[PDB]
Amino acid sequence: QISVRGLAGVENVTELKKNFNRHLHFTLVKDRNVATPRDYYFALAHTVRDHLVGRWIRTQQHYYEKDPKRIYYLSLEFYMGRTLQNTMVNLALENACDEATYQLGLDMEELEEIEEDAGLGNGGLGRLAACFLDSMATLGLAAYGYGIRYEFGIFNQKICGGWQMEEADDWLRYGNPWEKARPEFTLPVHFYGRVEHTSQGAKWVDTQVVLAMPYDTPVPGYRNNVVNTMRLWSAKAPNDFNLGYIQAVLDRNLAENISRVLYPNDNFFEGKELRLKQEYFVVAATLQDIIRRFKSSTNFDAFPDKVAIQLNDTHPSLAIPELMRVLVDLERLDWDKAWEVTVKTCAYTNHTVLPEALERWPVHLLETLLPRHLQIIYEINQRFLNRVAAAFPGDVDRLRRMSLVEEGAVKRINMAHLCIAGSHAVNGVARIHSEILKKTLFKDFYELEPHKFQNKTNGITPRRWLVLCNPGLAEIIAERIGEEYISDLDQLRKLLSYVDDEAFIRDVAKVKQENKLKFAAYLEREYKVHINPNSLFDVQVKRIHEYKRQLLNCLHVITLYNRIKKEPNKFVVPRTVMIGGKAAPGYHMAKMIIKLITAIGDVVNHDPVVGDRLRVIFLENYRVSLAEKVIPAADLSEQISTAGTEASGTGNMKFMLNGALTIGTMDGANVEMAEEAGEENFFIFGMRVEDVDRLDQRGYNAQEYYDRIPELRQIIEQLSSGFFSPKQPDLFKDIVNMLMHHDRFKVFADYEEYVKCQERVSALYKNPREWTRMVIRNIATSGKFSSDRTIAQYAREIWGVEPSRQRLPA
Amino acid sequence: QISVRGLAGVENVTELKKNFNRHLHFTLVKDRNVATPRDYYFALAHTVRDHLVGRWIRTQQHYYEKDPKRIYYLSLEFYMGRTLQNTMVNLALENACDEATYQLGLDMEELEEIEEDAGLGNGGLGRLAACFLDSMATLGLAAYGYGIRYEFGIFNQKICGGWQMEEADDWLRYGNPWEKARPEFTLPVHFYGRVEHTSQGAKWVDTQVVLAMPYDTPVPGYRNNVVNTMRLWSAKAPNDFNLGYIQAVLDRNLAENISRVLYPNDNFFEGKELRLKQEYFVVAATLQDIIRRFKSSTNFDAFPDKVAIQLNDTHPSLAIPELMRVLVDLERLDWDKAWEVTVKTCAYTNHTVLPEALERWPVHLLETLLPRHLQIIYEINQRFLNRVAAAFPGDVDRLRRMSLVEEGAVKRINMAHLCIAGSHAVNGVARIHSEILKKTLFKDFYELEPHKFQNKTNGITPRRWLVLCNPGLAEIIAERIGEEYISDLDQLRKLLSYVDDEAFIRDVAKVKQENKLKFAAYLEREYKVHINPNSLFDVQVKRIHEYKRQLLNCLHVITLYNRIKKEPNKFVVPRTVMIGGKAAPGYHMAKMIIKLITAIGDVVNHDPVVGDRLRVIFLENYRVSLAEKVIPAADLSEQISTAGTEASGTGNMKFMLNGALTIGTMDGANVEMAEEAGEENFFIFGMRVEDVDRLDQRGYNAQEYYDRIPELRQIIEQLSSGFFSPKQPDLFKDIVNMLMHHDRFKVFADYEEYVKCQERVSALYKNPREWTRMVIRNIATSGKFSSDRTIAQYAREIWGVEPSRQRLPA
């Protein structure tokens, strides 16, 4: 149908049709008489998978022959979403499969909806890893993603009586056609035990063994015939485990629980033993795999020339002492040489400055679970602090500030400090964030080793986040500037010459309207909710957190409602306000925020005086597949975190690429987005980081704002009195109390500027032509935010490898 | 190479080779450079599996169109063994695959050794179910095997320091190419809860739900293009299960433990809750499946005309009250009609008379787990006892003897009584056993309903137990009488005309020698044990039990050793005595017997005076695949249970078919085997059932035998004094004490006759020609013991269906 979706050649369509029929018969053991839509999805998935195989085998044999430096991306999270459409896009098979299935009497888009998301992540950090895998394959890097194959990913969110309910994400129930189990490459992982000192160094003995079984998933590059590997480890008990008899077999579950479930707590570091086990599990299995592959090329001097390990946050930080353990205890290298190798091999990426998210493991846990690693950490700390003492003689407080060991009621290990000490590079994820790291959190470390500190502004893949989710926009762009922009997003700048093009303006606006109509129909079919497609689609989708200030959005919504009730016969620009995202199960305030949003909806959506001028909808079960639907439909992107709290954001970039304008604070990547597009083409409001600092020095007093802003007072009085909860008047007392007395994120301080800025948004939306022209200026300058740019920078500035856009033979 | 293994046509070999290469590439994601023998096994398995698919789909659609009466075989055990060779045999693909793999530079026999046994059974009962599935498919019956997909089958047995050690049988580790998961046909199963009485009958409410997910395995008939289904249920938790969050997900294991492991206790009924859950799980899921299939043909009068349910022992006995529950509570049938339907549908097979094996469930367990079923059982009992009272007025003790409810310290439900009451047919498994049932255990029930009681003598499949495991013997037979005997074993009688044929005599003896050489080489390669291939191979393989009297064999072995030490320079016929089998993990005496056997070996095998005249070997990890190796190699089959204890035996039949002579008591099927072959062609010894009864009336005094038999005294003195355990002199005190004071199975009483009979065996073995002629007389009369004969009898006399040898279109 459309050009960017590839060719539908007669021979390809015929071949796809026969292979579809073959899989339905031989693989699924079905015939057309008893086959369901799910059977048809699986027949297509297996057919497309076949096309990956040849390329996958020859890519890996290519790396064996050429022996390039290998990049190992270690993450506890890979938020992959669905695989079928992405594979077709990268293999140029979309139009051919569309035609093949059509000729078989099937609708491919209907089959695509059957696939379960691989929801092996919480949010931004996990999705970043996924975009990175796509870009590394597209740039021809010999890259491997290493993680855990969780049996249960992020929970499915149900809304019942306005409250979040959690249900297990049984994503493997119907099988996973994309993965290949590799039980032959199973490796042992050790836990507990004790350290024995012999004449020839330390020995870790009397351990419990858990097996790590790898499952490999293909990661195709964009039309370059490169297929890389994501290897995820699954926990298995050894066969002699606990070997009355029946109970011993049943107790195997205890070992295998390591890979059972993704921790969904993304707000507050939880020092749980099972989580530590997960972190060591991935690290120990991965490092054995790396070393095996390195030896199959005695001399570890060349190790850093052939291996780069990227630590996604501190979650895989145990890689540092584990590598030291292997080099010193097993390979018999001297400490100093082992340390040189380790530092040159490892690099660390930080994703937040919020103190409650930082991993600080109790020493007593490490002592019991990983006794040798604790000893190694102590030795690292001692040698590091000796360097600090030599650099800053007499500065005793610096020594206590920089220590990997934190003193207190319970002694803890600061994993971020461990990462900085043991890495040759430390990066933040947006310019403002990287600057904050050097000025505040890691100031002491920056003063000691300035050369270690870098910035790598985040990005998103334009394959999933434009071509896949918004083919209409991709096509109208391709018509003007060709197809090269899909792997070279900077080419979108050429669209600036079309800002006064009447045809292009009409086409951009048409694509947005089509997307809005499609999503409006999706909501009715799947959730039975009615919306006006002509209204401004006002969207905030992301995990629920106080720092992200969904509460500030809530206050604006109530303001609009109150203004309508005050002057009912006055014209206002119609809005559909959509808020979605999951709350960590143990995060009470975040769960209260979800209840508030639904409670506002219950009042607003049923007020006859409002009509269709204002609708408030909570988008249930926000996840990658839902993001692909809602983002292309959005007019306004809400990026309203307190200045200095959102390290980067990546949702912001997805919205920019897909034709929404942004209302935001000068926080994270918003700063660079506004710099690229021009401040006049962004809706910037609120305190800057420096303003937040000034308010902190004086002391934040929320009462002041309540006393001075009558419209704000009204809302708080409504919340307190039970206007949004008639049958339970004190339901929102916790929210009111927090806002009035202990708001870390200064919601009231940005309220007035936010409301005024929102008025400027509505004013522009009244002028469709000028709205669309500003949209064009945003899309045209979104190029910097391709993860291809991000990965090229990691490659050149951290990993010491050159990216390649050259094709492998088909 | 050989005729019975089929044709190796040019087109078939070419096609198999290309499909092998296709699976290696696309299915396994390997190339010839990195592929291991296991990869090659899997490529072949997938290739052969493809040939099953068309036949499997068209067999099941054939049953849908013709709508014949369906046979449902319910068993907690299916002891299947390996599937690859059996599939090739039944599809006539063995020679073609042999040629195809040879041309690829691979040895097919080496690839066959890689497959894990499906060890989903303990012994005879489980293996009977497996032979039955093969025969039902061969006889064209619309039959379904229903069971549990255990994650762990029967434990792997290791011998360490002469003691049995248990290791988990992780048979699914590398995947199972034969099964097809059918998550779409998942069904709920209910547990616990309570019974509510409404105006419209009883309701079972507040239950916990476990899901039953089916996996289907193909069961091919012998060259008739019929492929039936074995459906095994796997336990799954619902997604809202226990839905802090993390623990709720981890607790899903509790529900899923139902299908985790096969209970290995085959001696003593263990009233464990988990076992009861397993039994209801299979019953509840299966009956829903049966009813669904029946409705997809309102009127349950025709139910018994379209459905037969065979209960393999009392393990699935809950089918009776479950069927009543569904008919009465859900379908709203009146009790009397529901009961008529239930009785006409169900039939029950008994496998033992030993009281300790009988299922007697505590009422308190059923009350908590299955409250509605208990109520139904009580009502069944009341109505049944009303019939007994009317038939035998005033006979109050009969009422207490026949009750389904047993009074005592703890009230119990006798599941065997439940089965008799609710079945239209009750059978034993050999003529003598069926007679014992009517005369003793179930005498009262026989007097009330004589028409219910039948005999169905057991059998074995000649596909697995001749063609597969002994192709050399199958071929020399085929040369003389053609190939028809493989599906019509009675044709073996034609071999009686070759008993004086010099060529045939030589060929039979040659095949045995080849088999013995092959097995002697297997022992050296895999276990590093040296044996003389010219010795008499004396074999007892079966589960370790006191009733099977491995101890009697042990006494004979020591007798031979002592006789050699007394007269070292006297000639004796050389023997290799092989004993193998697993002991139930909690069966102390059986574990002591294994230790005794190895201890005897340690003395005998290292005595220089003995030389190679006597060897005692314990065969480790006895299982279906090992049986296929050892049985064809055997000269003498030990079938030496106390008369009246072994219901049938089936190992006995396997040995007869494969050219071993039998030393045995007149017990179980041995009686019919001797009747078929002629008593002069069997080595019969010992007490008959009537002799055992006479000894019980007088009182068994083991001391009498010890006092009167000097050779027996010597052995007991050797055991007691520590001759077979120098470093631990009292090791075997438990064995001696049992033999002397509380031997339920009268080992000493058969000792003298056993030893004398063994002398007659050695005498015949000295004359190779006459030994072989007697062997021919055994093989020629083994026809009755085909499971094809057994199944034809079940079909005609119990199920009311006619077997068919007609081919389905290919």
Ligand SMILES: O=C(NC(=O)C1CCCCC1)N[C@@H]1O[C@H](CO)[C@@H](O)[C@H](O)[C@H]1O
């Ligand atoms: O997603 C994040 N943490 C988590 O999901 C949890 C933190 C606490 C431990 C569990 C993961 N962090 C996110 O990383 C993104 C990628 O750099 C950034 O764009 C966001 O600004 C940042 O909040």
Ligand SMILES: O=C(NC(=O)C1CCCCC1)N[C@@H]1O[C@H](CO)[C@@H](O)[C@H](O)[C@H]1O
């Ligand atoms: O194998 C048997 N029970 C078991 O394995 C256990 C009994 C106790 C509960 C668990 C199964 N029983 C066997 O059945 C065979 C087939 O009819 C007969 O040939 C044997 O004579 C009989 O012992």
Ligand SMILES: *Cc1c(COP(=O)(O)O)cnc(C)c1O
């Ligand atoms: C992009 C994405 C995120 C990250 O969004 P932010 O607004 O940057 O936090 C979270 N969840 C999903 C499913 C995403 O796709």
Ligand SMILES: *Cc1c(COP(=O)(O)O)cnc(C)c1O
């Ligand atoms: C046939 C068989 C049995 C049954 O043998 P009996 O001697 O009849 O008890 C037990 N185990 C296996 C593996 C078998 O093949």
